[PDB]
Design a protein around this ligand. Structure first.
Ligand code: HEM
Ligand code: HEM
Ligand SMILES: *[C@@H]1O[C@H](CO)[C@@H](O[C@@H]2O[C@H](CO)[C@@H](O)[C@H](O)[C@H]2NC(C)=O)[C@H](O)[C@H]1NC(C)=O
Ligand SMILES: *[C@@H]1O[C@H](CO)[C@@H](O[C@@H]2O[C@H](CO)[C@@H](O)[C@H](O)[C@H]2NC(C)=O)[C@H](O)[C@H]1NC(C)=O
Ligand SMILES: Cc1cc(NC(=O)C2=C(O)c3ccccc3S(=O)(=O)N2C)no1
Ligand SMILES: Cc1cc(NC(=O)C2=C(O)c3ccccc3S(=O)(=O)N2C)no1
Ligand SMILES: CCCCCCCCO[C@@H]1O[C@H](CO)[C@@H](O)[C@H](O)[C@H]1O
Ligand SMILES: CCCCCCCCO[C@@H]1O[C@H](CO)[C@@H](O)[C@H](O)[C@H]1O
Ligand SMILES: *[C@@H]1O[C@H](CO)[C@@H](O)[C@H](O)[C@H]1NC(C)=O
Ligand SMILES: *[C@@H]1O[C@H](CO)[C@@H](O)[C@H](O)[C@H]1NC(C)=O
Ligand SMILES: *[C@@H]1O[C@H](CO)[C@@H](O)[C@H](O)[C@H]1NC(C)=O
Ligand SMILES: *[C@@H]1O[C@H](CO)[C@@H](O)[C@H](O)[C@H]1NC(C)=O
Lengths: 552, 552
């Protein structure tokens, strides 16, 4: 019914109805004009002729290693390239944000209501004849069939980039501070009102929760000591609400900032490490500032840990997953003379693409044990049994699964994968190809081009008929990986700009925050600027075990 | 005891304690170095030894009328200057915001908690030996004595700039969407969580209040007709909470977005006008878009009225109060190639400086009647009796009071003036001279220099002893005005950057919003770009009476 149902406006032109059966494309600042914003301005043809494709740039970043070594060791040159990386990657995201699950046009409600995830692409209107707009059949193919045919794991496929369980659980722990769906309201709603890296998964989303978690001495968070080792306090001792099945002993219900972190020992491992890190930073600050009170010690340490998180995420975590030989750098100063908005709104599509469940193994191997999913979930006794040191050593050694490439979702979480499909449809996501165009990628012209093989493509052809009807979420998991890579093109090109905004958009990266006094002086500042996944583990885990995001 | 109590760091350097009796200044990016950030770097020496003073700039903007006349009539030149004006006025506000009433250092709590007003200068620490830090006596002078000696009106002092009651009530109506102190929590807290121009004073702060005010047909707001004229609906009809004394009959309990707007018929006049404007724009959009539903008509109209409001605030309202011969321009495009943060957090000091109660007359003169304060307050029957047309005609003719220059607060609101003093102290405001330095102004060296006269200066000298201990709020009302102006230097130099951020920081001014389709096409867009206080009144008040912000 809506004349904009067919998504006729190209190159980010905006579609507006002008009657029951007519539309107008607003081509303002797109660089194109004409009825559908497809005629390039002269400068546009110049830009287009020059810009390399994402696969070309990926090739360059993953080759000429000898050259990247030269670059990485020349400070001013590394800075220069990172500066370019930053600006190149930061023009695709609407900031201030625009659409959401209930608004396919800009509105004050969509802007102002922080309970929604934002949307990179507006939803397919409710009165459109087909789920994707006007293409395809009345209903999309059975989600169970999609799941069973091309997503479910047959044999475990290891990640060729060598990602390990330290990587998988770091991804889970880190992202679950800003992916926190409010199931009461619906899949298009979030409980993470900070919309980014605020460390609410350590400190609590609300002030009441934070205060229940705090010791109110020396800036510290409450903790218990068990067999000489520091662990989170209990629900019983703190009244911090946590999600635990009823059969869990009171003494095993650890209470942390994020209420779902009792779900798996690997989340609780990271919760425990960051808890120790907070109190460690508290000791350092108290040493540097014997005149400070508890409140300032707490707040300053939180700012420092936010800093360390952003640092580690960029220079270790994103560094590893990218596969780049270029050494990414966390340096807010690089944006100070550039246009950039210090703010972020978490996109629904970012949440959706980040469902990296293929990472998980069939069993979790710690020391000489192999835990099934059933044994592993909600089982903090496993953490106490083995200890943090053994957990790190074991997770560092265990390979994670490949995410793109298809057929690698562990069956234990098949309901989760089905729900990602079903809820994408519920939220009226536009198709894979629309999202590809939205991120300046070439539309796939066949299912074989998407997968790079023939068997899964054939299954999908039979299911969807038209590549233009293929959905974003399953596509991300069946996409042809880059050579020996964990992800395909669509995953990287969508994930990167969302991730950048969540990290650099933090206020601590703004010029008035990014200075020593914000972090209690040069000592606190140095903690941020020297942070690494290895140092986080070395400072807080007995014996300073070697760790890394890849298997050795 | 805090070693930062004396405010040792200059030129926006940040003070941090480094022990019980030592501090350190963080001079990062100040352009100065040395223990207190007072040694100018070389390039700072250049900038300084040729930056014109605010009074010089104000001289130039308010003279050479013939030159400005040429400038105003050459579009590219007017734009060029406005572009300069915009950037020259946007480097003084911390954005993302920093301090608040409870935090004299940056913290995640101060950044994230939207219920606080933010602070342009951090509060004086609790354990400082004196209210202002280290200077002055153990107690500030009796606020009643300060009020009675230099603030309270003897004889009515008319504004020489000719500001009228349309101006005064516009100031009150417009600002009360973002100055909404949460008295439950304290003077440092706000109920205006949008922190700017969101028009919650028409539409309501919350969705459920908004939905009570809406007709749910054609995008319109509920209204009632009395004697052939459109007025806001009642509390009985809508169920929205309003503040009214218990003796107001049900038929006079008007319901509007801001709960206090029944306080005064002047506010209800503007509430009525803006309600009519919303419904007018709904009519226009429905004509443009027969295919649109109620929700989109409502949301689009709200966006349009937001643009109208910003347009009128800049080009009529601020235009009048500034006294500039240069014609200010609302043009979001002028910021598109500039560094600028599209966000805003309302500053407590902005709230404080905007207590412009000396504007108020001794009596409110409508048609042939002169109403007293007791007669005027909470008396909407006056509005019904005379009507909007007579309100506009009368308020356009009636002169408002001068704000700077002292002794012009009407006795009827003396408790409000005393509270501004008392709450400033509660919120631990730094001194007038610290605020002047914060905004690049020369500190006053005596009370006579502050007032430009001798009698009020002498009383203040007796009360305060030291000019460096003089408080911000009463200083603003006793300050020497610019020549035949309504305000003095401090008022304009603090007010201007805060005001700019609230208006241009609005998301509708960002590039992704500032396009015709956001407002339902060129028709909606034209309504914003041609808006004016005269056309607002012309379109919505019977007879289209002439109006202006100047008695003229
Ligand atoms: C043993 C490990 C894991 C289990 C048992 C698990 C299970 C689940 C379940 C049941 C949900 C749905 C939760 C809900 O709807 O409230 C979910 C959501 C999610 N998972 Fe996993 N998952 C695991 C690991 C991971 C990993 C390694 C990642 C890496 C990125 C990940 C990413 C996500 C994301 C981003 C969501 C959506 C969060 C939200 O919107 O609230 N998960 N997972
Ligand atoms: C008949 C006219 C007016 C009356 C009866 C009035 C009265 C009041 C009162 C009772 C308060 C609350 C004080 C407190 O809680 O301590 C207040 C606050 C305020 N007034 Fe007025 N006023 C009037 C006109 C104006 C005008 C013309 C302006 C011009 C801008 C203005 C600006 C303000 C501001 C900015 C506040 C602080 C509001 C807040 O933070 O919520 N008022 N006024
Ligand atoms: C914003 O900060 C205020 C000030 O601390 C918070 O209000 C306090 O909240 C606690 C409950 O968490 C109450 O016991 C206090 O009475 C409140 N104090 C005041 C002065 O109101 C408020 O909760 C914070 N808001 C958010 C969203 O965290
Ligand atoms: C943000 O939007 C959601 C969705 O509209 C709002 O949730 C609705 O609020 C009304 C109250 O006016 C309830 O009657 C509905 O049940 C809510 N719907 C859902 C899905 O929860 C929410 O109130 C909005 N938040 C704000 C701050 O306005
Ligand atoms: C997949 C995937 C990729 C990804 N992120 C990135 O590719 C990606 C980042 O996350 C990012 C973070 C900080 C500064 C710059 C970059 S980047 O240039 O946009 N790039 C390396 N997150 O998930
Ligand atoms: C007093 C007072 C002044 C004032 N504002 C101004 O002086 C002032 C504005 O408010 C402003 C509004 C939009 C764009 C640019 C300007 S300005 O250059 O900062 N200037 C004229 N608000 O209260
Ligand atoms: C060659 C001069 C170019 C124009 C400069 C005009 C400056 C006059 O400006 C003066 O500034 C003083 C500063 O305190 C104020 O006291 C005066 O009121 C003001 O007139
Ligand atoms: C409403 C004003 C209150 C007047 C009575 C108490 C004020 C006492 O204050 C005095 O008032 C005189 C008034 O012009 C001034 O000459 C004095 O300088 C001032 O001290
Ligand atoms: C614009 O797009 C529509 C698709 O809805 C197409 O039918 C029309 O011919 C296009 N016009 C062009 C490309 O000039
Ligand atoms: C939890 O882990 C422990 C090992 O610490 C194991 O003995 C136990 O069986 C597990 N619980 C469940 C329900 O599998
Ligand atoms: C720095 O400031 C303090 C002011 O309290 C003063 O004691 C010291 O002499 C100053 N040093 C300078 C201005 O070089
Ligand atoms: C209310 O306004 C009317 C004029 O409409 C006036 O005559 C009356 O005195 C006012 N009421 C009070 C209590 O002042």
């Amino acid at each position: 019914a809506n004349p904009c149902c067919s998504n006729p406006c190209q190159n980010r032109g905006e579609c507006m109805s002008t009657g029951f059966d007519q539309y107008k494309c607003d081509c303002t600042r797109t660089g194109f004009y004409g009825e559908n914003c497809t005629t390039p301005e002269f400068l546009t043809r110049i830009k287009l002729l020059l810009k390399p494709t994402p696969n070309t740039v990926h090739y360059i970043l993953t080759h000429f290693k000898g050259v990247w070594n030269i670059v990485n060791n020349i400070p001013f040159l590394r800075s220069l390239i990172m500066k370019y990386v930053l600006t190149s990657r930061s023009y695709l995201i609407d900031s201030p944000p625009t659409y959401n699950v209930h608004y396919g046009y800009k509105s004050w409600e969509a802007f102002s209501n922080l309970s929604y995830y934002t949307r990179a692409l507006p939803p397919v209107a409710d009165d459109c004849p087909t789920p994707m707009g006007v293409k395809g059949n009345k209903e999309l193919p059975d989600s169970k069939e999609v799941l069973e045919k091309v997503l479910l794991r047959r044999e475990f496929i290891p990640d060729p980039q060598g990602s390990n369980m330290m990587f998988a659980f770091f991804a889970q722990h880190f992202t679950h501070q800003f992916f926190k769906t409010d199931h009461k309201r619906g899949p298009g709603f979030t409980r993470g009102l900070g919309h980014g890296v605020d460390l609410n998964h350590i400190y609590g989303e609300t002030l009441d929760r934070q205060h229940k978690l705090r010791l109110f001495k020396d800036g510290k968070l409450k903790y218990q000591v068990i067999g000489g080792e520091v662990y989170p306090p209990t629900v019983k001792d703190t009244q911090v609400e946590m999600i635990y099945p009823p059969h869990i002993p009171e003494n095993l219900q650890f209470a942390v900032g994020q209420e779902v972190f009792g779900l798996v020992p690997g989340l609780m491992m990271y919760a425990t490490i960051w808890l120790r890190e907070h109190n460690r930073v508290c000791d350092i600050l108290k040493q540097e500032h014997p005149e400070w009170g508890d409140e300032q010690l707490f707040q300053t340490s939180r700012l420092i840990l936010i800093g360390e998180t952003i640092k580690i995420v960029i220079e270790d975590y994103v560094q590893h997953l990218s596969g780049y030989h270029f050494k990414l750098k966390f340096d807010p100063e690089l944006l100070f003379n550039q246009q950039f908005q210090y703010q972020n709104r978490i996109a629904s599509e970012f949440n959706t693409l980040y469902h990296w469940h293929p990472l998980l193994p069939d069993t979790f191997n710690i020391e000489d044990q192999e835990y099934s999913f059933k044994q592993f979930l909600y089982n903090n006794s496993i953490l106490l049994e083995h200890g943090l040191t053994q957990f790190v050593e074991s997770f560092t050694r265990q390979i994670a699964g490949r995410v793109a490439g298809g057929r690698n979702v562990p069956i234990a979480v098949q309901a989760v994968a089905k729900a990602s499909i079903d809820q994408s449809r519920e939220m009226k996501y536009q198709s894979l190809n629309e999202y590809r165009k939205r991120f300046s990628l070439k539309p796939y012209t066949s299912f074989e081009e998407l997968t790079g093989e023939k068997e899964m493509a054939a299954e999908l052809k039979a299911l969807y008929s038209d590549i233009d009807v293929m959905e974003l979420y399953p596509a991300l998991l069946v996409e042809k990986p880059r050579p020996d890579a964990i992800f395909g093109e669509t995953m990287v090109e969508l994930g990167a700009p969302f991730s950048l905004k969540g990290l650099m958009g933090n206020p601590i990266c703004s010029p008035q925050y990014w200075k020593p006094s914000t972090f209690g002086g040069e000592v606190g500042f140095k903690i941020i600027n020297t942070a690494s996944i290895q140092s986080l583990i070395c400072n807080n885990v007995k014996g300073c075990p070697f760790t890394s995001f890849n298997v050795q």
